[PDB]
Write the structure tokens for this entry.
Amino acid sequence: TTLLNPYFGEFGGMYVPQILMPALNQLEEAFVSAQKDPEFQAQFADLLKNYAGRPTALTKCQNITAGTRTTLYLKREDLLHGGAHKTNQVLGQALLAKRMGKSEIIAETGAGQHGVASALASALLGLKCRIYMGAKDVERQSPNVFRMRLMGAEVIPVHSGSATLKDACNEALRDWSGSYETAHYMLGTAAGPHPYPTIVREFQRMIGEETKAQILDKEGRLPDAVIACVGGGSNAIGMFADFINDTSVGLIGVEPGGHGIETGEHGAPLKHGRVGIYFGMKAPMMQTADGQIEESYSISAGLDFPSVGPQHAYLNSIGRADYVSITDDEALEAFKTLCRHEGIIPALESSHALAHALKMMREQPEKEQLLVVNLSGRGDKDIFTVHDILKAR
Amino acid sequence: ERYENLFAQLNDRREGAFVPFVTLGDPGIEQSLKIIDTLIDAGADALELGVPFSDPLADGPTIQNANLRAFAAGVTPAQCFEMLALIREKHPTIPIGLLMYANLVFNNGIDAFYARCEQVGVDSVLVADVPVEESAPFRQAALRHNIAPIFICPPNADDDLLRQVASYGRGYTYLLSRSGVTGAENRGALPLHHLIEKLKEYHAAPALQGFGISSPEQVSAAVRAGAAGAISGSAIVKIIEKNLASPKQMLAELRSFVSAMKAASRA
Ligand SMILES: O=P(O)(O)OCCNS(=O)(=O)c1ccc(OC(F)(F)F)cc1
Ligand SMILES: C=C(/N=C/c1c(COP(=O)(O)O)cnc(C)c1O)C(=O)O
Ligand SMILES: c1ccc2[nH]cnc2c1
Ligand SMILES: c1ccc2[nH]cnc2c1
Ligand SMILES: [Cl-]
Ligand code: NA
């Protein structure tokens, strides 16, 4: 029995051990209550504005669209405190944690942005934070490990499996199943068991609300399409939500194509996997013929996850949103292009969204189109990774 | 009728059940079959057998490592079903329960999964990451193929859950000793007497206590608390892990442990 629908069509649900159901029911009730509470809403708005720096800019590209009929804006979530969109919903879930009388936070991270957001919010709001991070990601996103620890979070390398996000997710859930009485699990994407895909969307939806207001102010009309990378689904659903009922607006989500879909080394379950049950949810996932969960791959740690949030699987099934893939090399070229021609260093995750917008422009350069890319984070964490690769080439 | 028959016999004998868990195919198919025959010979009343799964989220490191060993030996679900058929052909009356994760049941169709279980002579299936709230297609398919669907009564169970578990479950009721994941290093509580009592009030399938049961004292204590028996996994799996290079010593130490645990179930 739930207050809200745990499903999006066939996708979603609450596929956790029975022990965790009271915790999920408690969280759902506290969210429904908070959403109606003007004091909670005022506290959340105050933190977003005066601590995190919202609203974030909407920047028009000056140079990268030259000689085409594409106008491209970037929603500047890279300017948010902490350096990515992840900060928005963490502030909301931290306030829920306090509301429920929890004193500790568990989070998973891959890019380390969610871990950084969880640690900064825990430091501000007086929670004890522990973060699980796969050992491969501890290496390729190390600037974030340093930031988490300086902010007082305990960072726990996960060596199991692929040593990436899935493995961090597993360990966080295992921990929670023993610690729920005192710990809130601050899940950092629009995935996992209900009510997380719903909560994360509602605490990220200001991205699309601000974007709509900003584009109306600058252009006098809605975008032709909004484009966002999809690792678990939070930045994309946060950009998409306020546009879902504007049926003229295209919603394009971009999964990591890795070394190429045909190599099997990718992270694009929505379009290239099969429905299954894992991480608390019925969702598309990369899986073997026998139903074991595969390991994903992406150059970008934050997209390196072999499933995807259930609202995206639903929006795809009904045709409201379209999903595509971008390879590591396409993402790297979009990274380089934004740094050199707009003076913005984007996260490699966000570079996948930008790469697909550049393709939309370059393939059809006399098509008139007004596009927004969600620039979900900044690329400071990636500069060592990208440096190595460009020098070598 | 294997669980019904077992509990009737145990009741007549004033005994609790002792039920070991192992992962099928750990540390290989042949050695696993010998392990299982050893467990039965040493006095196991029933078995709980895991099918290796890539991401076992209700399991601690000991059984994570059992799964990884089976995979290293190339064990697949199809091979597990061949093992199960061989086990039943040798042992016609022992109850056999599987520990599954949902994806492996859902993968090639829920109905098809339970039909395969029936064909090899499995008696029960516990899907660890399907709570009663999501159980409808799993419990329907189980009952259509004469398989008992096992449900969990956690220490945090409310009245609604007790009534659902009593109604929907068959074979035995899983009485969880504690929150957390499987592991011998985390000792659970004594069975909650109130939960055992409510389950009996609601005519639930007899309770077996599991998680953190690693010593004869804990088995005796479950029986005294009114549970029908106890399950031990990590403690048994630790004996496999320790003796990988010494397969004969492995079987000797498994027989010793199981016999001791079963002896403690005698009241
Ligand atoms: O002795 P331990 O601590 O290793 O416990 C062994 C338990 N093995 S089992 O198959 O009963 C078993 C039963 C339930 C499980 O998860 C669930 F409760 F969520 F359903 C996991 C394993
Ligand atoms: C894995 C992480 N981040 C993912 C991420 C993503 C992908 O996650 P979502 O699909 O949940 O937006 C997108 N953009 C940025 C800047 C990101 O940091 C993390 O920070 O833990
Ligand atoms: C509202 C409340 C609970 C629900 N469960 C399924 N759909 C729902 C809608
Ligand atoms: C996918 C899965 C889990 C995540 N936690 C934070 N970002 C994620 C993306
Ligand atoms: Cl030997
Ligand atoms: Na993904």
In short: Chain B has twelve helices and nine strands.
